């Protein structure tokens, strides 16, 4: 193979930019005042502490013990792409409930358990549990990066 | 009377000749079916040269003999083309 | 304490991620299948053996290849036509000298009950005499540049444009192009191969399209790149369904793919090389695809580039005979390697591999029905079946087909044996060639010869086979079944069998199919319905039962609903503990039981 | 290279500028991950810390070589994690060029 024909990560400018963000304290935090529970999803605003860019987290518990996380800009200049035709259906949701709260945290229960989601406000973070067993964390190394659409 | 396997190995009842199950190691008990892996089917082919074909081509839907006699219960109707 | 961190970095779009919480890997399979769907049920012929190269030169060559298979007693379902069959790489055309009568060629193949696959790539030669190009240009269906002109790159026909397959109107145009009126020279036994659909652009960055080319809705090419090929695959598959009036199941092979591509046919691992390490890597590559829903996977048998030594070609046939998509293919400049061109000892080994594959078609077909209904992969890593055996978590020189067969193909020149890891506490495995039983867990040293394909059947399983190998699968699909019962240590076994007409959607639209459950316990083998909705008119019957790990009974008694009780004759080998029940003679559609007294 | 960008002789006018997105996931108890084809690489995915991330970008690689993370013809952005105790999957639904880093603790 002729490797010089194909970009390494360092030659891919967005990969170079992203990969230079190393594990540390995330600047994103969730604005629990904006939290809204809906028929299909929990939505809460996220903010970059330095740039003040506002994002929207759409968090969903799904039937068949799945979670969906979608993050988009709050007021984008132009719509961002959302992949069509791959999903065979709009995935059936399960109801989210606030089953715990403190100053820096909201605990959500998917339906009637056993799956729970802990949204940490500062720094922004998500933890997924079956009862008390931690299954997976999101943004635990603080590597979330969302380049907003500029002028 | 019983049937003796052509190689001489075994002997089987008369109703196990052409009963669509392979009972003979040389395939000689199934000259008219597709049941034996090493059997052969004889095509008389009157008006042309007689031919032997693999047992696996009896009623496989493909016309192997010009007289069409290898396809007698397959849904393929083979015309006679021996001329 | 141990932990793995995963980080995803994407150029554009939103963040959109699904977390599939298991807890078992089969739960994950079900979770992901509910999101992106399941493996399309292949028409039966497409699970047979495919003979391809770049290129068979003309109609006479194709018919000589077809006749070569029959003259050398080797089965084959499909012969493939690569890009040199068209008029100067104008797709949907035929070279007027070398393929002047495609309908007559297709009719001769149909008379042998074989199929043909023609390649159709998504790049369209910029040529005012080319009707496809003129239609797409006139209707504005091409990918564009920012200045609004149609994008033009370079591929096999030279300068070429690229239809915007993200546009639903373009996909509908493409689908309608496969009608028998539009694709002149095509017929119902002609199926399709989509290649170069990354899309490949010879003079583009990284050999693909510019990031700032513009698609339907104004989206940039950088936004959609990885589903471009999927849309090609989808539109072609829909074309093959539509041309038949919605009755025939499609077969489309695609090079590029994405999540969801399992819905549209098969994929293969591209341009590999005729070398032993490329033979080896076909297992982890197709296993990685199987884990993410693409069960209809394979690699070019023999390697695309370079000429394989005969021993390597034999081992590749044996490897490919036990992988889902089974195609021999080769580069333009390679020597001809149709399998009868080798010396007789290599021919016989290849013929045996082909026979094993064709005999296992009912098994393969049932695994693919289970994949289609449940989302379970056909070819599986050992850890999927043995999730608690940590010594299996990295194995990639072995794999399972369903839960019943464990395969360790020979993948080294001059090998004298292989080391087979047989997993499972209190599990037994049967060498399907010698019937020798082996207890798990162990690493077994198995001596091999050129003809060896190390395959083991798991205790507790029932594998259905067509023991009457014919020239193609169409010829076999009404033939009787032999059941191979591998007894567990508890004297039990179970398995399934799916049957239908082999090529239509009638199983779905009319529930015209059979799903049988075979189960053994105590000393009784029982066939019952695993889905009562399915009914099928079929002459398929049970001609034989082979039971491994069984003692000699005193008598064998068969009971079928609607018939008197009857006696079966049988043969027993005390050395191998193998019991063969002669000609049960019962329809596969009937409930029945055999009792060993 | 954040806006107008060049690689070899090819130019990306990149009219919308930098728009990349990224996010990390931690899998406690998992030492083995699998998936994200297509790569000519081992079934059990390797750590990327000392080298290149795994790349998902449908590309035509002439005479591709073995045991490396270069992107090949197909991209399925799905990663499976297996341990003695549980199985998990991550499905990153994004159609753009995507890089995947894998690290162990
Ligand atoms: N106008 N074009 N000019 C031009 C002329 C020659 C060359 N050099 C030879 C390319 O080298 C190769 O052979 N690549 C493997 C291609 N493999 C594809 C396609 C195919 O081979 C035929 O459909 C299938 O059989 C394979 O299965 C499928 O994967 C180039 N070039 O840019 O290299 C450009
Ligand atoms: Ca007989
Ligand atoms: Ca015939």
CATH of residue C484:
2.60.40.1180
For chain B, give every domain's residue range.
Answer: 1-30, 39-83
Residue C126: DSSP 8-state: -
Distance CA C347, CA C353 (A): 10
**C77 catalytic per annotation:** no
Tokens 């970059």 correspond to what residue? A48
D with B: 3 or more CB pairs under 8 Å? no
Task: Give dist(CA C512, CA C533) in Å, integer.
Answer: 9
Kindly tell me whether chain C and chain B come into contact, counting contact as 3+ Cβ pairs under 8 Å.
Answer: yes
Strands C442-447 and C493-499: unpaired
Q: What is the 3-state secondary structure (H, E, C) of C259-281?
A: CCHHHCCEECCCCCECCHHHHHH
Distance from C-alpha of C561 to C-alpha of C152, rounded to nearest angstrom: 68
**Mutation for testing the D interface, residue in A15, A27, A125 having most D CBs under 10 Å:** A15
Cα distance from C588 to chain B (closest Cα, Å)?
16
Min CA distance, C309 vs chain A (Å)?
Answer: 23
**Distance (Å) of CA B42 to CA A56, B32, C320, C544:** 79, 8, 35, 26
Pocket of ligand 1 (CB under 6 A): C 54, 82-83, 119, 154, 156, 158, 195, 202, 255, 270-271, 304, 329, 331; D 62
Q: Is the N-terminal amide bond of A123 cis, ω within 30° of 0?
A: yes
Tokens of C534: 């399915």
- Ligand nearest, relative to CA of residue C157: 1
Distance B3 CA to ligand 2 centre (A): 10
Q: Where are the beta strands (DSSP E) in chain B?
A: 3-4, 11-12, 40-43, 51-54
3-class SS string, C368-390: HHHHHHHCCCCEECHHHHCCCCH
Q: Kind and range of the H or E element at C344?
A: helix C344-359
Using alpha carbons, select from C67, C60, C69 the residue that is nearest to residue C104.
C60
Task: Take atom 2 of ligand 1 and give the residue whose Cα is closest.
Answer: C156
Per-position b or e across C68-107, b if 16+ CB within 10 A of its CB? bbbeebbbbbbbbbbbbbbbebbbbbbbeebbeebeebbe
| Fold exhibited by the domain B1-30 | Low-density Lipoprotein Receptor (4.10.400)
Check CB contact of A129 with chain D, cutoff 8 Å. Answer: no
Comparing C-alpha atoms, which of C232, C264, C252, C260 is closest to residue C34?
A: C260
* Sheet hosting strand C592-596, strand order edge to edge: C566-568, C556-560, C592-596, C524-529, C514-521, C493-499, C461-465, C481-486, C541-548, C578-587, C570-573
From which experimental method does this structure derive? X-ray
Question: 């910029």: which residue's tokens?
Answer: C126
Nearest CB among B20, B21, B62 relative to C113 is that of B62
Instruction: Write out the binding residues of C.
Output: 82, 255, 329
Show the domain range for C504.
461-596
> Whole-angstrom Cα distance, residue C403 to residue C459?
10
DSSP-assigned letters across all residues of C450-464: TT---EEEETTEEEE
Cα C569 from Cα D86, distance rounded (Å): 49
8 Å CB contact between A61 and A69? no
The answer to whether the Cβ–Cβ distance between B60 and C471 falls below 8 Å is yes
Q: Where are the alpha helices (DSSP H) in C4-101?
A: 25-36, 59-71
- Identity of the residue in A6, A8, A136 whose CB atom sits nearest the CB atom of D25: A136
Is the minimum CB–CB distance between B54 and chain C shorter than 8 Å?
yes
Q: Which of C379, C394, C392 is nearest to C423 (CA)?
A: C392
In this complex, do B21 and C583 lie within 8 Å of one another by their Cβ atoms? yes
Could you give the count of Cα atoms lying within 13 Å of C391 in the half-sphere of its Cβ? 8
Q: What is the resolution of this structure in A?
A: 2.1
Say how far residue C121 (Cα) sits from the centre of its chain: 21
Instruction: With beta carbons less than 8 A apart as the criterion, state whether D98 and C296 touch.
Output: no
Distance between CA atoms of C413 and C60, rounded to whole angstroms? 36
Determine, yes or no, domain membership for D94: yes
Distance from chain centroid for Cα C123: 26
Tokens 């090529």 appear where? C503
For A25, list phi and psi in degrees, rounded to 5. -80, 120
Q: How far apart are CA C89 and CA C123, in angstroms?
A: 9
How far does Cα C363 stand from its chain's mean position? Answer: 12
Residues 6+ apart with CB under 8 A from C518: C462, C464, C483, C485, C493, C494, C495, C496, C497, C525, C526, C527
Instruction: Output the CA–CA distances (angstroms, integers) from residue C131 to C99, D62, D89, in the order listed.
Output: 19, 31, 47
Ligand nearest to C-alpha C118: 1
Q: Beta strand D78-82 with D32-35: parallel, antiparallel or unpaired? A: antiparallel
Q: Is B touching A (3+ C-beta pairs, cut-off 8 A)?
A: no
Antiparallel, parallel or unpaired: β C481-486 and C541-548: parallel
Given A17, A86, A139, which is nearest D93 (Cβ)? A86
**Total tally of structural domains belonging to chain D:** 1
Round to whole Å and give the CA distance between C468 and C541: 13
Nearest CA to ligand 1 atom 23: C83
Q: Considering C195, C352, C474, C500, which one is annotated as catalytic?
A: C195
* Four-residue CA torsion sign, C268, C407, C368, C34: negative
Residue C124 distance to chain A (closest CA, Å): 24
CA C407 to chain centre: 16
Tokens 């490396």, residue?
D68
Residue for token pair 């403190």: A102
In sequence order, the 6+-apart residues with CB closer than 8 A to the CB of C131 are: none
Q: Ligand 1 center to residue C156 CA distance, Å?
A: 7
The structural domains of chain A, with segments of one domain joined by +, span 25-138
CB D41 within 8 A of CB D81: no
Q: Which of residues 260-319 of C touch D (CB under 8 A)?
A: 261, 267, 269-273, 277-278, 281, 283-285, 287-289, 291-294, 305
**Which residue among C9, C207, C259 places its CB closest to the CB of A86?**
C259
Question: Of the candidates C410, C458, C418, C413, which has an alpha carbon nearest to the alpha carbon of residue C438?
Answer: C458
Q: Out of C80, C304, C333, C334, give the residue to mutate to test ligand 1, the one with the largest number of ligand atoms within 8 Å of its CB.
A: C304
The C-alpha atoms of residue B42 and residue D41 are separated, in whole angstroms, by: 54
Which residue shows structure tokens 């108890």? Answer: D29
CA of C414: how far to CAs of C278, C308, C409, C448, C472, in Å?
Answer: 17, 14, 13, 10, 32
Cβ burial, residue C190 (10 Å; 0-12/13-18/19+) = buried
The alpha helices in C243-343, defined as continuous H runs, are 276-291, 310-320
Chain A nearest-CA residue for D64: A1
- In terms of Cβ atoms closer than 10 Å to its own Cβ (0-12, 13-18, 19+), residue C443 is exposed
Give the DSSP H/E element, type plus range, for residue D33.
strand D32-35
Domain hosting D84: range is 22-105
Closest chain B CA to residue C569? B23
Picking from C175, C192, C250, C190, the residue whose alpha carbon sits closest to that of residue C504 is C250
C-alpha span between C456 and C547 (Å, rounded): 14
Please indicate whether, in this complex, the C-beta atoms of D19 and A1 are within 8 angstroms of each other.
no
What does the alpha-carbon distance between residue C459 and residue C469 come to, in Å, rounded to a whole number?
26
Q: With contacts defined as CB-CB under 8 Å, which chain C residues touch A70? A: 14-17
> What are the CA-CA distances from residue C27 to residues A69, C19, C374, D87 (Å)?
20, 12, 10, 8
Alpha-carbon distance of B47 to B59, in angstroms, equals: 22
Give the H/E segment covering residue C237: helix C221-242
Residue located nearest, by CA, to atom 5 of ligand 1:
C156
Distance CA D22, CA C11 (A): 9
d(CA C51, CA C324): 15
Chain D interface test: which of C2, C10, C208, C297 (most D C-beta within 10 Å): C10
- Which class for A49: exposed (0-12), middle (13-18), buried (19 or more C-beta within 10 A)? middle
Would you tell me the crossing angle of helices C361-374 and C344-359 to the nearest 10 degrees?
50
Residue D57, in any domain of the structure: yes
Binding-site annotation, residues of C for substrate: 82, 255, 329
SS3 category, C396:
coil
| CATH number of the domain encompassing residue D59 | 2.60.40.1760
Is A140:D13 a contact under the CB 8 Å cutoff? Answer: no
Nearest-CB residue to B60 (from C475, C480, C583): C475
Torsion (CA) C31, C222, D98, C256 in degrees, nearest 10: 60
| Closest-approach residue (CA) in chain A for C11 | A14
CB C51 within 8 A of CB C69: yes
Helix axes C168-177, C131-138, angle to 10 degrees: 160
C277 as an active site residue: the answer is no
The number of C-alpha atoms within 13 Å of C310 and in the hemisphere containing its C-beta is 14
Whether residue C479 lies within 8 A of chain B, CB to CB, comes out as: yes
């Amino acid at each position: 193979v002729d490797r010089s024909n194909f970009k390494t990560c360092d030659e891919s400018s967005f990969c170079k930019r992203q990969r230079s963000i190393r594990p540390g304290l995330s600047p994103y935090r969730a604005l629990l005042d904006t939290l809204q529970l809906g028929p299909d999803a929990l939505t809460v605003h996220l903010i970059h502490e330095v740039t003040k860019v506002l994002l929207v987290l759409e968090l969903q518990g799904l039937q068949k013990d799945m979670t969906r996380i979608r993050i988009d800009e709050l007021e984008p200049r132009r719509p961002r792409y959302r992949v069509p035709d791959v999903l065979v259906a709009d995935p059936p949701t399960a109801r989210l409930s606030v089953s715990g709260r403190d100053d820096n945290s909201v605990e959500l229960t998917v339906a009637e358990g056993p799956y729970k989601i802990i949204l940490t406000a500062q720094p922004f973070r998500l933890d997924l549990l079956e009862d008390r067993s931690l299954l997976l964390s999101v943004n635990a190394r603080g590597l979330m990066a969302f380049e907003h659409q500029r002028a | 009377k019983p049937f003796t396997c052509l190689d001489g190995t075994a002997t089987i009842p008369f109703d196990q000749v052409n009963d669509d199950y392979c009972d003979c190691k040389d395939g000689s008990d199934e000259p008219g079916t597709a049941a034996c892996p090493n059997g052969s089917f004889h095509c008389t082919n009157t008006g042309y040269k007689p031919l032997y074909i693999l047992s696996s081509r009896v009623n496989d839907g493909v016309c192997d003999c010009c007289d069409g006699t290898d396809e007698y219960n397959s849904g393929t109707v083979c015309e006679n083309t021996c001329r | 304490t141990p932990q793995t961190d995963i980080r995803w970095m994407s150029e554009s779009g939103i963040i959109d991620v699904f977390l599939m919480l298991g807890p078992s890997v089969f739960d994950v399979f079900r979770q992901y299948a509910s999101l992106t769907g399941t493996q399309a049920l292949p028409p039966l012929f497409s699970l047979g053996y495919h003979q391809s190269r770049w290129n068979y030169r003309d109609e006479a060559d194709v018919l000589e290849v077809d006749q070569g298979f029959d003259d050398h007693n080797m089965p084959c379902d499909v012969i493939w036509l690569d890009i040199e069959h068209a008029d100067g790489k104008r797709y949907f055309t035929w070279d007027p000298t070398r393929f002047p009568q495609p309908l007559n060629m297709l009719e001769h193949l149909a008379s042998k009950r074989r199929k043909l696959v023609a390649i159709v790539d998504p790049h369209i030669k910029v040529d005012s005499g080319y009707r496809v190009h003129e239609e797409l240009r006139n209707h504005g269906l091409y990918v564009k540049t920012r200045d609004g002109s149609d994008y033009e790159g370079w591929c096999w026909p030279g300068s070429a444009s690229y239809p915007d397959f993200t546009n639903p109107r373009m996909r509908a145009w493409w689908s309608n192009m496969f009608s028998f009126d539009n694709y002149e020279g095509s017929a119902p036994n002609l199926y399709v191969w989509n290649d170069m659909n990354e899309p490949s652009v010879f003079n583009g960055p990284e050999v693909t399209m510019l990031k700032d080319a513009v698609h339907y809705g104004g989206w940039e090419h950088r936004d959609i790149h990885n589903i471009y090929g999927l849309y090609v695959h989808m539109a072609t598959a829909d074309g093959l369904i539509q041309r038949s009036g919605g009755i025939e199941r499609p077969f489309v092979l695609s090079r590029a793919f994405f999540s969801g591509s399992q819905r549209f046919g098969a994929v293969w691992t591209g341009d590999n090389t005729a070398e032993w390490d490329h033979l080896k890597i076909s297992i982890p590559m197709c296993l990685s695809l199987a884990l993410v829903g693409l069960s209809f996977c394979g690699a070019d048998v023999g390697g695309f580039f370079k000429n394989p030594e005969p021993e390597l070609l034999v081992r590749w046939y044996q490897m490919g005979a036990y992988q889902p998509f089974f195609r021999a293919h080769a580069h333009l400049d390679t020597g001809r390697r149709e399998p009868w061109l080798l010396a007789s000892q290599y021919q016989d080994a290849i013929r045996d591999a082909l026979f094993q594959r064709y005999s296992l078609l009912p098994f393969w077909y049932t695994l693919f029905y289970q994949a289609h209904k449940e989302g379970f992969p056909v070819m599986r890593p050992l850890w999927v079946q043995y999730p608690e055996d940590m010594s299996t978590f990295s194995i990639e020189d072995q794999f399972m087909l369903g839960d019943a067969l464990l395969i360790h193909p020979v993948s080294d020149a001059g090998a004298h044996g292989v080391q087979v890891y047989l997993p499972g506490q209190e599990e037994v495995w049967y060498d399907i060639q010698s019937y020798q039983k082996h207890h798990g867990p162990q690493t077994l040293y198995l001596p091999v010869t050129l003809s060896s394909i190390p395959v083991f059947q798991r205790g507790g399983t029932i594998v259905p086979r067509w023991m009457r190998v014919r020239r193609s699968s169409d010829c076999m699909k009404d033939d009787p079944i032999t059941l191979f019962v591998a007894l567990s240590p508890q004297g039990t076994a179970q398995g399934e069998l799916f049957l239908d007409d082999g090529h239509t959607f009638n199983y779905q639209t009319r529930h015209e199919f059979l799903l049988r459950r075979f189960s053994f316990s105590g000393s009784t083998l029982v066939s019952s319905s695993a889905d009562p909705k399915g009914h099928l008119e079929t002459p398929i019957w049970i001609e034989r039962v082979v039971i491994m790990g069984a003692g000699k009974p005193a008598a064998v008694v068969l009971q079928t609903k609607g018939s008197p009780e009857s006696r079966l004759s049988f043969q027993h080998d005390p050395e191998t503990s193998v019991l063969i029940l002669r000609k049960p003679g019962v329809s596969v559609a009937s409930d029945w039981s055999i009792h060993l007294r | 290279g954040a806006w107008e960008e060049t690689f070899k002789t090819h130019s990306d006018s990149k009219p919308y500028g930098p728009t990349s997105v990224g996010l990390d996931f931690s899998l406690p108890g998992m030492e083995h991950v699998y998936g994200i084809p297509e790569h000519a690489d081992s079934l059990r995915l390797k750590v990327t810390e000392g080298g290149e991330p795994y790349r998902l970008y449908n590309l035509d690689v002439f005479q591709y070589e073995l045991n490396n993370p270069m992107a090949l013809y197909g991209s399925v952005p799905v990663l499976l994690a297996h341990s003695f105790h549980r199985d998990l999957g991550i499905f990153w639904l994004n159609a753009a060029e995507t890089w995947v880093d894998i690290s162990s603790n």
